[PDB]
Design a protein around this motif. Structure first.
Motif, short mmCIF file in Angstrom:
data_model
loop_
_atom_site.label_atom_id
_atom_site.label_comp_id
_atom_site.label_asym_id
_atom_site.label_seq_id
_atom_site.Cartn_x
_atom_site.Cartn_y
_atom_site.Cartn_z
N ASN A 1 -26.23 35.45 2.62
CA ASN A 1 -24.87 34.83 3.27
C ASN A 1 -24.98 33.51 3.53
O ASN A 1 -25.67 32.55 2.87
N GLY A 2 -24.06 33.00 4.49
CA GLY A 2 -24.15 31.33 4.99
C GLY A 2 -25.31 31.15 5.68
O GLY A 2 -26.15 32.01 6.26
N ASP A 3 -25.70 30.12 5.47
CA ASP A 3 -27.03 29.47 6.09
C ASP A 3 -26.67 29.39 7.60
O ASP A 3 -25.50 29.26 8.12
N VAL A 4 -27.69 29.03 8.42
CA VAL A 4 -27.74 29.00 9.92
C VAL A 4 -28.24 27.57 10.24
O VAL A 4 -28.03 27.16 11.29
N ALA A 5 -28.80 26.74 9.34
CA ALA A 5 -29.38 25.41 9.55
C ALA A 5 -28.51 24.38 9.99
O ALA A 5 -28.18 23.85 11.10
N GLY A 6 -27.44 24.18 9.05
CA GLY A 6 -26.21 23.29 9.15
C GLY A 6 -25.44 23.63 10.29
O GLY A 6 -25.08 22.77 11.16
N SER A 7 -24.70 24.65 10.42
CA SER A 7 -23.91 25.23 11.16
C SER A 7 -24.33 24.79 12.79
O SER A 7 -23.11 24.58 13.53
N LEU A 8 -25.30 24.74 13.02
CA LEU A 8 -25.66 24.68 14.48
C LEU A 8 -25.48 23.61 14.98
O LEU A 8 -24.74 23.40 16.31
N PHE A 9 -25.71 22.46 14.67
CA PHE A 9 -25.44 21.23 15.24
C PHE A 9 -24.05 20.60 15.30
O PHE A 9 -23.44 20.50 16.25
N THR A 10 -23.26 21.01 14.25
CA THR A 10 -21.78 20.87 14.29
C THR A 10 -21.30 21.75 15.39
O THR A 10 -20.09 21.30 16.17
N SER A 11 -21.62 23.25 15.57
CA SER A 11 -21.07 23.80 16.33
C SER A 11 -21.35 23.47 17.91
O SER A 11 -20.45 23.27 18.81
N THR A 12 -22.49 22.93 18.25
CA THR A 12 -23.05 22.35 19.55
C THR A 12 -22.07 21.16 19.84
O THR A 12 -21.42 20.85 21.20
N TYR A 13 -21.75 20.20 18.77
CA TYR A 13 -21.15 19.09 19.30
C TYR A 13 -19.60 19.49 19.37
O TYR A 13 -19.00 18.93 20.20
N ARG A 14 -19.12 20.19 18.39
CA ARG A 14 -17.79 20.73 18.60
C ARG A 14 -17.42 21.62 20.24
O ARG A 14 -16.35 21.28 20.66
N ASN A 15 -18.33 22.30 20.53
CA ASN A 15 -18.16 23.00 21.70
C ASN A 15 -18.59 21.90 22.93
O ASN A 15 -17.66 22.04 23.80
N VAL A 16 -19.46 20.90 22.85
CA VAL A 16 -19.80 20.24 24.37
C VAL A 16 -18.90 18.90 24.25
O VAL A 16 -18.36 18.64 25.31
N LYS A 17 -18.72 18.29 23.08
CA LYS A 17 -17.76 17.00 22.87
C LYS A 17 -16.35 17.43 23.17
O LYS A 17 -15.61 17.19 23.93
N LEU A 18 -15.82 18.18 21.93
CA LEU A 18 -14.45 18.42 21.81
C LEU A 18 -13.79 19.12 23.04
O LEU A 18 -12.98 18.56 23.57
N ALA A 19 -14.17 20.44 23.17
CA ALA A 19 -13.72 20.94 24.17
C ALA A 19 -14.61 20.57 25.52
O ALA A 19 -15.63 19.94 25.37
N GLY A 20 -14.08 21.02 26.69
CA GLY A 20 -14.83 20.79 27.68
C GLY A 20 -15.77 21.64 28.06
O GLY A 20 -16.22 21.70 29.31
N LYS A 21 -16.25 22.55 27.33
CA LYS A 21 -17.37 23.45 27.30
C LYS A 21 -18.74 23.05 27.65
O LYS A 21 -19.17 21.94 27.47
N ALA A 22 -19.34 23.89 28.51
CA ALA A 22 -20.66 23.37 28.79
C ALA A 22 -21.78 23.64 27.79
O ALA A 22 -21.61 24.34 27.02
N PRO A 23 -23.03 23.29 28.14
CA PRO A 23 -24.16 23.39 27.15
C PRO A 23 -24.50 25.01 27.20
O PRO A 23 -24.85 25.25 25.65
N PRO A 24 -24.58 25.76 28.19
CA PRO A 24 -24.42 25.56 29.56
C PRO A 24 -26.16 25.68 30.33
O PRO A 24 -26.67 26.54 30.44
#
Ligand code: TA1
Ligand code: GTP
Ligand code: GDP
Ligand code: MG
Lengths: 436, 290, 187, 158, 428
Positions: B1-24
């Motif tokens: 299926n889809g890879d797991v290597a790439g998705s993780l960094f972009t997800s963490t950036y979208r969550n922490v920077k873009l939204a006000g979401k926590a690391p947490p």
């Protein structure tokens, strides 16, 4: 995300690194003891130091740098100085014995046994970086360490990465003022290995910067720390666009695409303006046009080269502070209408301009004053071949008598290295000519 | 299926920077700079915590009313009467509470000592892996469990390296992977026991890749369902009820409620003629997909 | 200690030639003596330790207890002269499981006996100068069936003359060794 | 009474009146990549924190020793028509009135984020109400029996 | 119905999109929180053309934000109107564009399109009757040109019947903020001509003059320039949004402006434009708005109309007015400057009109013209390209992405073929 790896080899490298890593820790509010206070924090914010630091598990910010040297005495001064809580001791790499201004001792005998730990430190430091913009080398051509190490280092670095980009800030043996007697040898020897490996390489010399500090700041007592401060200011102005906001951001990838037209031709000049004391700035307004004329003035360069004997294959401007783009577009138009400045036919364009809103900072006790504007000029002009021909002449003027050749042939070298570096320099000069 | 290597960094950036979401609040105790080796804590991850409820807060059972009522208040001299007078739920268990995940894994320790032949390859168009040696000649028995044990990590670049390590070794593994299965169950179970969404969504995609990496891996895994399905039974019904709202998040894999359904379908696909009952025994809500 | 350092090809813990060789070593003498003298065969300095009651005159590698010598190199090599006396040395090891084994080699012993925390074994020393190499990773596998992780402490008892103590990370040959890491016995 | 803070479209400054001349020196505000159209500004009793409304709806509280920014605004949502009429109750809390009639009380004491300890929360909301029309002016009256009576003039001339 | 999806490529395209979405969000009277607080019903009748509904009565834009180097996407998120975008309508990558059209169109573009196409498909299906697309390029940078064209080619082979706009900002003839800029221009044009239906061309240099002479602005920042691009981009669609005595869908603007498939590079202008002083004295009538629009200065492109003739033009009015006046105004203009038009086209202007004007104004208009004056722009670039390509300057970067030289030679010849067609129909 946008981080760099800053090496400092030799003595001049790690001396200028003193100023550089003082300027950075001051510009970002980092205290000398690793950590910044709790006040300077702005809610949730990063990437303001991520480029030049890594935050530890709690508090400390350790700089993402390396201080490599073979003479124990300057790394010991650093270890004992005030900026010792910053560096984790395993950063500062030392050695029992120096190269003693021998390129052979630097490249074949002594550095061959410490590149392994240098590369391991670099491995451990570059895996920590998510998006690696590049390595910034601080070599010092004209000394044994610099000449042999930086070369062996870059060979290993290119055989490891290759595609990754290396920018170097080398000091070059000034034609008049020279504190060595064999240094043409090691300069010629270092060039053949660096050209093929590094990707961009600025050049500067102590003579031009002595003159600059005499003319503008009016200091009759300049020392090496004064030159280090200016080098740090130039590098801060350069790496602003990576670590700050502002119209027309600049990243190393694009910056090297649109300044190096041909693979070989990447040596380039430098210039900085305005550069003045406090009383001078008090009787001035510092228009963007004034600053760009000062920057483009050939006397304000940091290399003893005359641009009016050549053309400009391209250039690059990085303003700072209070600037708007219409001003830059008007200044470049004035400059391109001017006649003293030439441009090769095949580049009707040729001005990559970048801006940002973070004003330049002044280090307390320093020499510069506070200003709301600043300009660093970087240009790939075909006039620089004169400072190569100087050393081309000097190498053979000494090699004809074959003086000092015995050191090199006893320290694990032969004669053919000289001839191959000579041929390379001749080819480089022919290539520089070919572009007219 | 889809890879797991790439998705993780972009997800963490979208969550922490873009939204006000926590690391947490990822605990980074004992870990200093990138140079100093960390001091591994003796604790273990995914560990059930004891009950902290006080002595007295436990209500007492009234023999007369058949009810658990809280004890009365002991008198106090400060609160004495004056002239005028005219006038129990049980302590919930941390079923869905994120366990504490200390950085005391084995992958971090081995990478610190520098025994791994991996490195980050920035020269690629993105984050890639760079091997000092040839993958298909490694000793899987020694390396593959180490790489699985780093999935639980959250500090960069350890978790990226660990996920990318297993992702690349499973492709070229082939037959060399089958005899290693008995050694992969403990780190997989430990990663799932953390209750943390990031590590769980990663390990489920890795588990899919694991059953697909070779043949005969399904039957060989079947006996080990009793130690990996117990967590599946929890988050099997954690889904999003959007109604008419199209799920843009479907671009990446975040919804456990179906990341578990796909994985259970795959297990039944590969396990043979008896995987269904071994699944139905652990997760009772499951339905045969054949 | 020795954590977050760089060990790739060699790691010298003790060298008789230097301004102060027992930088990190603790020394305990009861009825003996430690000094540095110039050997005759290998015409250089060797740090000698001697004295009665072998089990009491020794030197421990970490300066003090509660401090470990984190070193992950498999092979361990000593360069010792054989004085035809009682000589023994001990090395503590951390297994893959958090258990601190320890192996010791004695020249006054004749049988090996594996135990939960100890493994005593005889050593058949040659005459005069000789270098002894320990696999130190085959030993843990052969004794307890586990894997080697990292040494913790080293200890060398009396009646010997030390010249070199170094971890090797692999069995290097007499050719591959550098000049300092070999036995050059002059005439 | 020698310094004064002023806010506007995309700028905040603190000006100090020099004594040697007829000049006053400004110091600009440094906020992390934030572009906010400040509308109302209030200063606490002890010049600690300047609170500033925003057309977006945030209530940015900043320190004033150095003017840098500290906390964003009301958690659990965001004021509808942007903050317009802001005032301070002597207890240390802030009355905020947006351009829709939402009048609420934010207790502004620097709090640590529960989950992430080295992080701060946003300002919670003690009380809230709806009045008719955009709120434009707030004045105080110390009754001190139970609370305080604030005279609130709304854009609808109520 | 007639819903439209909106894309923003590159840094500039992501920046002007922050204004276009801020101007429109105020037109229909919604908040930065995404809630509606207008007063009339015309704010709601055709709101679905620009937004999708959300839970709790919120409105979010039907926008896509594509750009490498996510640093820019933190900016637009932090602006006063970043809170309306769905934080999963953000596709990005950590690596840079580097102004290398190749990597933006060959290596790092191919890594994202599979994700972008996933996002555009998701909200292409969120529209009952999807009208068309529209993008925001910057023919200088590598993101805008490289990724934009690669995306467009993908859309064309997937939604052939639909229509693709392009508000591409062209490089400047005099100003060149980059150095490899002509390489990025010509290579993109080789893609647009066959893979678009309408392509506005705009230059910041003309935007500086308009802000300098007319608006009398001292310091035009990029916001003001973006504030103008936002103004016109809203003016194109008021027919689709608001009632109009003669409404103009985008497909009927197409057929009335591009008689031949290739002559789809337009020239745009807005009116009224005055300072704060002149606003007091000037009166707002159809005459003022049509002489100002028909002036050679309001043309935001670096092209001189007087060096060409209008193959076709079109004016869009919004504001309660009389249709007779606008009917004769375009007649008189067609009579006097008979040299500035063609003969084989009897009437070569279309005068649409809307019923609702802009927010604070009372009359406004927008000028769109398909003149042969634009052929100048492509002539210029075709020299700067053939200047350095004759010397193979900077070309090694482009060979570094599996490209070749045939790609350039074919690309250049495509423009020379194109500008040749603009001459045929310009009989001087
Ligand atoms: C008292 C009065 O009438 O003030 C005007 C005004 O004087 C002038 C000068 C306005 C004013 O515009 C500017 O000052 C300006 C500055 C830089 C760049 C462009 C404009 C105005 O800002 C613009 C504003 O116009 C609008 O609101 C339009 O509907 C316009 N709005 C926006 O662009 C906008 C969007 C978000 C937030 C704020 C403004 C619009 C145009 C097309 C489609 C939708 C909306 C108004 C009436 C005025 C001021 C306030 C001075 C002008 O702008 C417009 C587009 O109306 C500049 O030329 C016009 C002529 C107007 O008379
Ligand atoms: N601009 C500037 N130049 C310096 C500084 N310090 C030294 N230099 C110059 O560096 C050159 C010598 O470099 P070194 O590093 O000392 O020589 P080396 O490469 O270490 O070789 P070895 O001496 O054998 O170890 C001389 O030309 C110095 O003038 C400084 O602080 N600033
Ligand atoms: N109107 C406007 N134009 C801009 C702005 N910023 C950049 N531009 C122009 O857009 C071009 C750069 O494109 P860019 O997106 O930054 O590079 P890319 O990421 O490789 O596509 C340059 O010609 C800039 O001058 C802006 O803020 N407003
Ligand atoms: Mg030196």
């Amino acid at each position: 995300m946008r981080e760099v790896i800053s090496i400092h080899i030799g003595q001049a490298g790690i001396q200028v690194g003193n100023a550089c890593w003082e300027l950075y820790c001051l510009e970002h509010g980092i205290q000398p003891d690793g950590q910044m206070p709790s006040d300077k924090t702005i809610g949730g914010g990063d990437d303001a130091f991520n480029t030049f630091f890594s935050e530890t598990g709690a508090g400390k910010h350790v700089p993402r740098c390396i201080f490599l040297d073979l003479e124990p005495t300057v790394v010991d001064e650093v270890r004992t100085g005030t900026y010792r809580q910053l560096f984790h001791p395993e950063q500062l790499i030392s050695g029992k014995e120096d190269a003693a201004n021998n390129f052979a001792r630097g490249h074949y005998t002594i550095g061959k046994e410490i590149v392994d730990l240098a590369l391991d430190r670099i491995r451990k430091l570059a895996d920590n970086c998510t998006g690696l913009q590049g390595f910034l080398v601080f070599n010092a051509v004209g000394g044994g360490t610099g000449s042999g190490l930086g070369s062996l280092l870059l060979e290993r670095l290119s055989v490891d990465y290759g595609k990754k980009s290396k920018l170097g800030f080398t000091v070059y043996p000034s034609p008049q003022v020279s504190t060595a007697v064999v240094e043409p040898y090691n300069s010629v020897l270092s060039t053949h290995s660096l050209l093929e490996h590094t990707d961009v390489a600025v050049m500067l010399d102590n003579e031009a910067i002595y003159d600059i500090c005499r003319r503008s700041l009016d200091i009759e007592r300049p020392t090496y720390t004064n030159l280090n401060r200016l080098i740090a200011q130039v590098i801060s102005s350069l790496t602003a666009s990576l670590r700050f906001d502002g119209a027309l951001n600049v990243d190393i990838t694009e910056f090297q695409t649109n300044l190096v037209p041909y693979p070989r031709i990447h040596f380039m000049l430098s210039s900085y303006a305005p550069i003045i004391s406090a009383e001078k700035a008090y009787h001035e307004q510092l228009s963007v046009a004034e600053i760009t004329n000062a920057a483009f003035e050939p006397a304000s360069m940091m290399v003893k080269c005359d641009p009016r004997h050549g053309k400009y294959m391209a250039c690059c401007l990085m303003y700072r502070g209070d600037v708007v783009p219409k001003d830059v577009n008007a200044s470049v138009a004035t400059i391109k209408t001017k006649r003293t400045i030439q441009f090769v036919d095949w580049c009707p364009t040729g001005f990559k301009c970048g801006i940002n809103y973070q004003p330049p900072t002044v280090v307390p006790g320093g020499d510069l004053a506070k200003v709301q504007r600043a300009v660093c000029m970087i240009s790939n002009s075909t006039a620089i071949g004169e400072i190569f021909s100087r050393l081309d002449h000097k190498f053979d003027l000494m090699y004809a008598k074959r003086a000092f050749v015995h050191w090199y042939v006893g320290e694990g070298m032969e004669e053919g290295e000289f001839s191959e570096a000579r041929e390379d320099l001749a080819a480089l000069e022919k290539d520089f000519e070919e572009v007219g | 299926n889809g890879d797991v290597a790439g998705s993780l960094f972009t997800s963490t950036y979208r969550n922490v920077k873009l939204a006000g979401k926590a690391p947490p609040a990822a605990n980074l105790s004992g870990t200093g700079s990138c140079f100093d080796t960390t001091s591994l804590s003796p604790a273990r991850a995914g560990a059930h915590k004891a009950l902290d409820v006080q002595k007295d807060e436990l209500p007492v059972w009234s023999k007369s009313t058949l009810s658990y009522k809280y004890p009365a208040g002991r008198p106090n001299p400060t609160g004495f009467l004056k002239k005028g007078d005219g006038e129990p739920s049980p302590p919930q268990a941390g079923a869905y509470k994120r366990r504490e995940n200390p950085p005391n894994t084995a992958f971090r320790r081995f990478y610190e000592r520098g025994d791994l032949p991996i490195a980050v390859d920035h020269r690629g168009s993105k984050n890639m892996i760079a091997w000092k040696v040839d993958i298909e000649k490694l000793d899987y028995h020694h390396y593959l469990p180490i790489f699985f044990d780093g999935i639980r990590e959250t500090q960069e670049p350890y978790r990226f390296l660990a996920v990318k390590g297993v992702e690349d070794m499973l492709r070229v593994g082939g037959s060399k992977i089958l005899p290693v299965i008995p050694q992969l169950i403990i780190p997989i179970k430990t990663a799932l026991n953390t209750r943390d969404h990031s590590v769980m969504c990663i390990t489920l995609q890795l588990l899919q890749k694991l059953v697909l990496s070779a043949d005969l891996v399904g039957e060989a895994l079947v006996p080990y369902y009793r130690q990996i399905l117990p967590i599946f039974n929890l988050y099997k019904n954690k889904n999003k009820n959007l109604g008419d709202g199209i799920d843009y998040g479907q671009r990446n894999y975040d919804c456990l409620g179906e990341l578990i359904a796909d994985t259970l379908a795959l297990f039944e696909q590969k396990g043979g003629d008896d995987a269904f009952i071994n699944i139905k025994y652990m997760v009772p809500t499951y339905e045969s997909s054949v | 200690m020795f954590k977050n350092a760089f060990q790739s090809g060699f790691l010298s813990v003790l060298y008789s030639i230097g301004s102060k060789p027992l930088e990190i070593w603790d020394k305990q003498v009861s009825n003996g003596h430690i000094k540095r003298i110039t050997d005759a065969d290998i015409q250089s300095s060797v740090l000698e330790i001697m004295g009665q009651n072998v089990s009491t005159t020794y030197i421990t590698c970490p300066a003090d207890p509660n401090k470990t010598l984190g070193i992950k190199l498999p092979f361990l090599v000593l360069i010792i002269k054989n004085l035809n006396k009682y000589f023994s040395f001990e090395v503590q090891v951390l297994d893959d499981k958090n258990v601190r084994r320890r192996f010791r080699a004695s020249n006054y012993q004749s049988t090996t006996r594996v135990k939960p925390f100890i493994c005593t074994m005889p050593m058949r020393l040659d005459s005069g100068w000789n270098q002894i190499q320990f696999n130190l990773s085959d030993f843990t596998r052969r004794a307890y069936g586990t894997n080697y992780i990292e040494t913790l402490r080293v200890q060398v008892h009396a009646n010997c003359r030390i010249r070199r103590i170094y971890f090797s990370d692999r069995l290097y040959s007499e050719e591959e060794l550098p000049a300092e890491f070999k036995l050059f016995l002059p005439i | 009474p020698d310094k004064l803070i002023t806010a506007g479209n995309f700028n905040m400054n603190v000006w100090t009146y020099d004594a040697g001349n007829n000049k006053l020196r400004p110091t600009d505000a440094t906020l992390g990549t934030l572009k906010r159209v400040f509308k109302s500004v209030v200063v606490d009793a002890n010049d600690e924190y300047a609170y500033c409304g925003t057309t977006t709806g945030d209530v940015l509280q900043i320190a004033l020793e150095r003017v840098l920014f500290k906390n964003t605004g009301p958690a659990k949502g965001n004021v509808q028509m942007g903050v317009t009429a802001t005032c301070e109750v002597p207890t240390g809390d802030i009355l905020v009135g947006g351009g829709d009639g939402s009048l609420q009380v934010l207790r502004t004491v620097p709090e640590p984020s529960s989950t992430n300890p080295k992080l701060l929360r946003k300002m919670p909301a003690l009380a809230g109400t709806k009045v008719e029309g955009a709120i434009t002016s707030i004045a105080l009256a110390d009754m001190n029996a139970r609370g305080f009576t604030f005279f609130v003039g709304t854009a609808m001339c109520n | 119905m007639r819903e439209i999806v909106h894309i923003q490529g590159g840094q500039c395209g992501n920046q002007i999109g922050a204004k276009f979405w801020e101007v429109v969000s105020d037109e229909h009277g919604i908040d930065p929180t995404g809630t509606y607080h207008g007063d009339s019903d015309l704010q709601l009748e055709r709101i679905n053309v620009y937004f999708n509904e959300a839970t709790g009565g919120r409105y979010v834009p039907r926008a896509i934000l594509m750009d490498l180097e996510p640093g820019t996407m933190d900016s637009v998120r932090s602006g006063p109107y970043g809170q309306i975008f769905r934080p999963d309508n953000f596709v990005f990558g950590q690596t840079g564009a580097g102004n290398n059209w190749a990597k933006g169109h060959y290596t790092e573009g191919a890594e994202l399109i599979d994700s972008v196409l996933d996002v555009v498909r998701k909200e292409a299906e969120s529209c009952d009757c999807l009208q068309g697309f529209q993008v925001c390029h910057s023919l200088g940078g590598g993101t805008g040109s490289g990724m934009g064209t690669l995306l467009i080619s993908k859309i064309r082979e997937e939604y052939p019947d639909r229509m693709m706009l392009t508000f591409s900002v062209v490089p400047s003839p005099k100003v060149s903020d980059t150095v490899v800029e002509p390489y990025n221009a010509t290579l993109s044009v080789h893609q647009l001509v066959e893979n678009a239906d309408e392509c506005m061309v705009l230059d910041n240099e003309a935007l500086y003059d308009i802000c300098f002479r007319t608006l009398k602005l001292t310091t035009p920042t990029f916001g003001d320039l973006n504030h103008l691009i936002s103004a016109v981009m809203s003016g194109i669609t008021c027919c689709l949004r608001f009632p109009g005595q003669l409404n103009a869908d985008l497909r009927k603007l197409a057929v009335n402006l591009i008689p031949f498939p290739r002559l789809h590079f337009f020239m745009v202008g807005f009116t009224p434009l005055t300072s704060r002083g002149s606003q007091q004295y000037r009166a707002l009538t159809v005459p003022e708005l049509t002489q100002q629009m028909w002036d050679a200065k309001n043309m935001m492109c670096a092209a001189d109309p007087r060096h060409g003739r209008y193959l076709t033009a079109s004016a869009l009015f919004r504001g309660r007015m009389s249709t007779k006046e606008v009917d004769e105004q375009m007649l008189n203009v067609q009579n006097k400057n008979s040299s500035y038009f063609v003969e084989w086209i009897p009437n070569n202007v279309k005068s649409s009109v809307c019923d609702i004007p802009p927010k604070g104004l009372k009359m406004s208009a927008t000028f769109i013209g398909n003149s042969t004056a634009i052929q100048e722009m492509f002539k210029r670039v075709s020299e700067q390209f053939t200047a350095m390509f004759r010397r193979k300057a900077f070309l090694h970067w482009y060979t570094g992405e599996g490209m070749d030289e045939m790609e350039f030679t074919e690309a250049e010849s495509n423009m020379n073929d194109l500008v040749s067609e603009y001459q045929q129909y310009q009989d001087a």
